[PDB]
Amino acid sequence: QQTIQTTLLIIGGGPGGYVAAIRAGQLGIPTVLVEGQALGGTCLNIGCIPSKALIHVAEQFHQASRFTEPSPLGISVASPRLDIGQSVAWKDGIVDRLTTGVAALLKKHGVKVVHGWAKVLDGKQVEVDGQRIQCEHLLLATGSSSVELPMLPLGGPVISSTEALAPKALPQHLVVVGGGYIGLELGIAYRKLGAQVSVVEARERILPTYDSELTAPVAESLKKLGIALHLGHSVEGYENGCLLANDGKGGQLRLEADRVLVAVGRRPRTKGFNLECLDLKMNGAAIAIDERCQTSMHNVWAIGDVAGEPMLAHRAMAQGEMVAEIIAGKARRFEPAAIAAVCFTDPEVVVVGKTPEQASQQGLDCIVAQFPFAANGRAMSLESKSGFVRVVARRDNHLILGWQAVGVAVSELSTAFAQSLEMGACLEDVAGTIHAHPTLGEAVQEAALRALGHALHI
Amino acid sequence: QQTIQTTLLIIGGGPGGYVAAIRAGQLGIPTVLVEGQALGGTCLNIGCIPSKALIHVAEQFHQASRFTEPSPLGISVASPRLDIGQSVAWKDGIVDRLTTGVAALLKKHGVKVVHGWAKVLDGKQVEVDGQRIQCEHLLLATGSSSVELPMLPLGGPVISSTEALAPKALPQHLVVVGGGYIGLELGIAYRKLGAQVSVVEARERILPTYDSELTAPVAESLKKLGIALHLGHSVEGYENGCLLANDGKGGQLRLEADRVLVAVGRRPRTKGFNLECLDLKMNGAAIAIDERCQTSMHNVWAIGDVAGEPMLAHRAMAQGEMVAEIIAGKARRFEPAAIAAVCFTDPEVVVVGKTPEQASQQGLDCIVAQFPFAANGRAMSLESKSGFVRVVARRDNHLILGWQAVGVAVSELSTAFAQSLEMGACLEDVAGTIHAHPTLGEAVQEAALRALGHALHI
Ligand SMILES: Cc1cc2nc3c(=O)[nH]c(=O)nc-3n(C[C@@H](O)[C@H](O)[C@H](O)COP(=O)(O)OP(=O)(O)OC[C@H]3O[C@@H](n4cnc5c(N)ncnc54)[C@H](O)[C@@H]3O)c2cc1C
Ligand SMILES: Cc1cc2nc3c(=O)[nH]c(=O)nc-3n(C[C@@H](O)[C@H](O)[C@H](O)COP(=O)(O)OP(=O)(O)OC[C@H]3O[C@@H](n4cnc5c(N)ncnc54)[C@H](O)[C@@H]3O)c2cc1C
Ligand SMILES: NC(=O)c1ccc[n+]([C@@H]2O[C@H](COP(=O)([O-])OP(=O)(O)OC[C@H]3O[C@@H](n4cnc5c(N)ncnc54)[C@H](O)[C@@H]3O)[C@@H](O)[C@H]2O)c1
Ligand SMILES: NC(=O)c1ccc[n+]([C@@H]2O[C@H](COP(=O)([O-])OP(=O)(O)OC[C@H]3O[C@@H](n4cnc5c(N)ncnc54)[C@H](O)[C@@H]3O)[C@@H](O)[C@H]2O)c1
Incomplete structure (x- = not known):
């Protein structure tokens, strides 16, 4: 199998990647994108669209559930039922339509999309399932992965975001380790779907990044909704059918949960592929990048989650398109307001x-x-x-x-x-x-x- | 009963009026507001809030109604019921809270609010149920009223917006003469609440002010929703249990309707109070005003619907506050973008x-x-x-x-x-x-x- 040789090689086909591609195809730079798993990335397949779509079906189940009790609106319904198989099949159609469409525009602007994982060989070549691929600018958009807890390996009962976005049945009591947007968006949605839910969080309060003035309305709805909120507690184990958490000095809590959802954070994906062969300066778990999204090795570029910093899709989409334009000549610098x-x-x-x-x-x-x-x-x-x-x-x-x-x-x-x-x-x-x-x-x-x-x- | 004597007298206590008041109280101009009926006006009592609040309860009835049929969301409910008494009681609480609050802020900024209708005596005095009231600047914010059809007097079965916002029972088939925002917002809401609905409109299409590119999505939903759409037809009568409309040359249509809702337009309220005693230049059915909202008689000012032009609340609210500031010295001119x-x-x-x-x-x-x-x-x-x-x-x-x-x-x-x-x-x-x-x-x-x-x- 022979050398593919390009100008711009992009590792990863999620938000940052496919928009660096689409604008570089658009600007006419020879471009190839490597993608291990499926296009769109975490956002389209196991993040962004499937969470907001589960939140929507949870909202419609909840609103027809409230009408079993008296409402001032005068509407009444009997027998609200939710068998989540269909909610998920629905969710999956949408993800499907959107990945499909990303292929279409990548074909349309003619970028070669090669599947399989890429093991980096140097800041110019890469090996993807055998064939080497060389290039002038390497753009990494490997993404992020969810932090696993050491005494609480994922497996069965301990699921992470990815599996919460994929029930075949709903929990009787679900506990949620982490009270950031992922834990809360998913916890509220599990509760409206009908499961019991408790959020356990190691700080003063829910959404600890944000001030209490702002965050206080959310707290009150979780409390209104029947979602227990064990703040100040950290999770230490799950003794097969029961979860144990402690509060710092000495506090207890034995919550009998039969599903736990660790939503304790997201780490840059820097390991498992040979990124370590290169002289890259770091910033904790993430690749350091300047305002031009370039690493410490000249024609190597990093965007999105691998660059850590605010871990959001529109950030990645907007760094992708800017890198593409810099490689094609335009003078830019990422300083959004x-x-x-x-x-x-x-x-x-x-x-x-x-x-x-x-x-x-x-x-x-x-x-x-x-x-x-x-x-x-x-x-x-x-x-x-x-x-x-x-x-x-x-x-x-x-x-x-x-x-x-x-x-x-x-x-x-x-x-x-x-x-x-x-x-x-x-x-x-x-x-x-x-x-x-x-x-x-x-x-x-x-x-x-x-x-x-x-x-x-x- | 004795002369009240002010600087700014305002006729009408709807959007334009109470914000001209509140900012003139705020800026400290002696201010009095006359208001025949109830504060807030058409918007708060029989427009803005009660329509959008009926639209909301119609949406929640419709969404739990669709779940009697299979949905891709997997939710199912039996027996959706709506007895609109409660929907209306709900609606009325909200209108109540908001009128109340407008009194509070008018008291708070200390403007005297006198009830009863005002018959104008000259561009300086007014008579409200006996007591004369004099002033330096007269601001009229008398509003607008709904156009009545000559062969179709309102009464019982022929209701207008005001009564559509107030059922004690819902129609079996409601026909809607006029396919502008009032007719359509109300028609869609009558259909989701469960009544049969047809829209009859005298032009090419629904929302004839707006191009077909834009308006076409709405048309398709009315058609999806089961709302018949007799465009090109004009309404000539209602022979007790049946409505007759004709299309220009010669077309028929006998729609058996037991409620008709004329929503054929809104006229400036210029008559019934002695506005005719004053030398005011006109612009059709409305008072002519310059960019400073002043009439052709110097310290007389007109805002909102009585000034016709775009008949909307935020327009009135924004003309009120500007007049108030001009009277108090600030140099202004209404030229919004x-x-x-x-x-x-x-x-x-x-x-x-x-x-x-x-x-x-x-x-x-x-x-x-x-x-x-x-x-x-x-x-x-x-x-x-x-x-x-x-x-x-x-x-x-x-x-x-x-x-x-x-x-x-x-x-x-x-x-x-x-x-x-x-x-x-x-x-x-x-x-x-x-x-x-x-x-x-x-x-x-x-x-x-x-x-x-x-x-x-x-
Ligand atoms: C549940 C959840 C909800 C979220 N919701 C929101 C939201 O609503 N809004 C928001 O802005 N953010 C949200 N996010 C943010 C998050 O989705 C990221 O912002 C976004 O996915 C980042 O895109 P990225 O460019 O870093 O790549 P990613 O989507 O992480 O994808 C990178 C791709 O690189 C591939 N890959 C990595 N290395 C290789 C390799 N060496 N060779 C080949 N392929 C490889 C991976 O398979 C992956 O698909 C959510 C995240 C989660 C988990
Ligand atoms: C069903 C419906 C829905 C609407 N929805 C919207 C909407 O969603 N958004 C939007 O922007 N617009 C909407 N409107 C617009 C409409 O409400 C006006 O924009 C708004 O009401 C205009 O306020 P105004 O200042 O002209 O006074 P009005 O609210 O018309 O009130 C003027 C007041 O003057 C009083 N009055 C008149 N003469 C005298 C007198 N001589 N003495 C004492 N009292 C008197 C009347 O009793 C009246 O309350 C809606 C209208 C209707 C009917
Ligand atoms: N990790 C980063 O460097 C980074 C950077 C920017 C944004 N983010 C966002 O974080 C997301 C992933 O997680 P998140 O939404 O939960 O946000 P997050 O990383 O801010 O929150 C994780 C939460 O779990 C709590 N926690 C930690 N250990 C716990 C334990 N053992 N028991 C109970 N509570 C515990 C933490 O205090 C925190 O509130 C990403 O998608 C991204 O959008 C992360
Ligand atoms: N009337 C004005 O001068 C004026 C100015 C600006 C905005 N508006 C808006 O109009 C609102 C009041 O009415 P609307 O929402 O229906 O708007 P509108 O006045 O634009 O529409 C009335 C509709 O009824 C149709 N029609 C007239 N006679 C008919 C008949 N006999 N049979 C069938 N159809 C007929 C007209 O073509 C029109 O489409 C006001 O609240 C205001 O917001 C009116």
Whole structure:
């Protein structure tokens, strides 16, 4: 079998990879992508789309479940049933349509996609199931993997995200080790589907990265939903039919769980393929990269999760397309104004830009203003799930530094938050924009009116 | 009873009125508001909040109704029941909380609110149930009323928006004369609640203000939903238990309906109170106003629906606050970049800024690009209801002139569309902003990438 020889070789075919490919095919750089498993990556096959699609079928099961009890809406139904086989078959069709479509556009722009795992040989060649492949620029987009707990190997009963996104039956009591977006999005969805759920988390609170003002609405819904919340506890074992966790000094807890879901973090995928043969500078578990996504070895490039830093899909998609353009001549440098973060928890949290905390750390004097959804008509049409919108701005020129929001159907305000920040808006431009009634985004205009000293509905 | 004497007198206590009040109380102008009926106006009591809240309970009844038939989601329920008394009681609580809150803020900023109808005496005094009231600036915010059909007086069986927002029972077959947002939002909601529905409309198509590219998704859902659509027909009568409509030359149609809902338009409220005693220039059925919302009689001001022009709440709210600031000294002029329009139809249409049509009329050369939701992951998690996002930009400097979108849960993209337009964004700034995955607003970044020549998922 003979040498394939290209200009751009990309290791990995998830978000970062297939968009570095598609734009390099588009820009006309000879490109080849290696992909061990299936295209789209973690996002399309066992992340992004299958989680948000399970969350949706969990929401529709929950909403027809509440109508067995009296509601102020006057709707009543008997016998809500969920046999998750079909929920999963549904989920799988969607993943299918989307991987298919990524092949189509990779064919369309003509990049050669070779399957099998790639063992690196040097910063120029690679061996994929026998055939060597050489290139001028190597782009690594190997991704990330889930951290395993030493006394709690995955296997059967201990599943990770990947298997939680794939039941053939649902648990009687599921325990969730880790109270970050993966644990919470999955825990809430397991509870609405009908399983009992407890979240065990080793810090003060759920979503410990985020302040308590913001995170507090989510906590209250888990507590409303019947999801126990053993904070301050760390997990030490699972004595066959029972889980044991301890709180630091001396606390107990024997939770009889028959499914545990470790969702304790994500590590850069740097091992198992010969990355170690190369002189690459590191940043903990991840490859160090400069603002041009290049490693310490010249024509080697890293993007997405392997570069650690914020581990999200749109970050990878946006580093891929930028690398592609730099190799093709265009002068670029990844300095976004912010990378929007969204958690599809009930309620949803959205953080885009600086939090108050962060603004203080960097030594800024801030106007921080908030407008709640209980004073919002749209929110009330929607049975609310109260939270608020918060704005953070420079007290001297009102240049907005960040945006955070908590509430029902808030995820789509992120588009607005990100673009206002990409443009360099001040509170004034946001406040002085007519926002349409009745929408949840009226709260964004009012949270900016309040910072300025003149809100109308609070 | 004695002369109340103020600086600013406001006739009408709906959106335009109570925000002209609240900001004039805030700015400290002696202010009094007259209000015949109840605060908040048409929006809060018989428009905005009660329609969107009935649409929501119709959505929850429909979604638990579909689960009697097989779904790919695997959820099943028996016996969906809706006795609308409770849906309406629910609706009424929300309207209640919101009117209450408007009183609170009007008390808080100390404006005197006097009830009863006001008969104008001159452009300075008014008589409200006996007591005269004088002032320096008169602001009229009398609103709008629904056009009645001459051979079809309202009464019983012929209801208008106001009574459709208030059943004690639902119709067996409801016919809807008018296929604009009121008729369609209400028709779809009557159908999901379980009533049979036909829309009769005198033009080529549903939402005749809007182009067929955009409006076509809605049409297809009405047709999917079982809502008959007699376009080209005009209504001539209702022979007690049957409706008759004709199509222009000679066509028939005898629809046996036992409820008809005329939703044939909205007229400025200029009559019934002595507005006619004043020298005001007109613009058809509405008061003519300049960019400072002032009438042809100096310290007389008009806002909202009485000024006709686009008949929407956020327009009124934003004219109110601007008048208040002009009277208090600040130099202003209402020239928004656009007034966002939203229809809570299934699917939702959102138009913000220039349509292609409009851009051609004004003689502009345009890039018009579109990105659909079938190529969008978020849309698929959501069972889609496919439509697209469209962008319109100047072919010479890519300055964005407008934004339109059709689809499920699209209403919240309006915040983004409006602010990007208020800032003067070009396609580039939108496209070069990291949008979060998986959201419906990824379609907004891609529709801008496509206009530029380089989209990634289409
Ligand atoms: C449950 C879950 C939910 C998530 N939800 C969200 C979300 O909603 N939004 C968000 O932004 N982020 C979310 N993420 C983020 C996460 O999906 C990443 O952001 C995204 O997958 C990163 O893409 P990447 O470029 O690093 O590659 P990955 O998708 O990790 O894929 C890299 C690919 O490289 C392949 N590979 C690696 N080495 C080789 C080799 N040497 N040879 C051949 N093939 C190889 C792998 O098989 C893999 O498919 C989620 C993650 C999880 C697990
Ligand atoms: C069913 C329906 C749905 C709607 N939905 C939307 C929507 O979702 N979004 C949107 O933007 N628009 C919507 N509208 C728009 C519409 O509500 C107007 O935009 C809004 O109500 C306009 O406010 P306004 O200032 O003109 O006053 P109005 O709300 O019309 O109220 C004016 C007030 O003046 C009072 N009044 C008049 N004359 C006197 C007098 N001489 N003395 C004392 N009192 C008097 C009246 O009693 C009235 O309450 C909807 C309308 C309807 C009917
Ligand atoms: N790991 C990284 O370097 C990194 C970087 C950026 C973003 N992230 C995000 O993290 C995701 C993977 O995990 P996550 O969503 O849970 O986030 P995470 O890594 O922030 O959270 C893991 C949670 O588990 C908790 N925990 C640890 N050990 C525990 C134990 N033994 N018992 C109980 N609780 C324990 C931790 O305090 C933490 O709250 C990735 O998809 C990515 O989006 C990770
Ligand atoms: N009337 C105005 O000057 C004006 C201005 C701006 C916006 N609007 C909006 O219109 C709303 C009120 O009505 P709408 O939503 O139906 O909008 P609309 O006034 O645009 O639509 C009324 C519809 O009924 C149709 N029609 C007229 N007579 C008919 C008949 N006899 N038989 C069958 N069809 C007939 C018309 O073609 C039209 O499509 C207001 O709340 C406002 O938001 C009105």
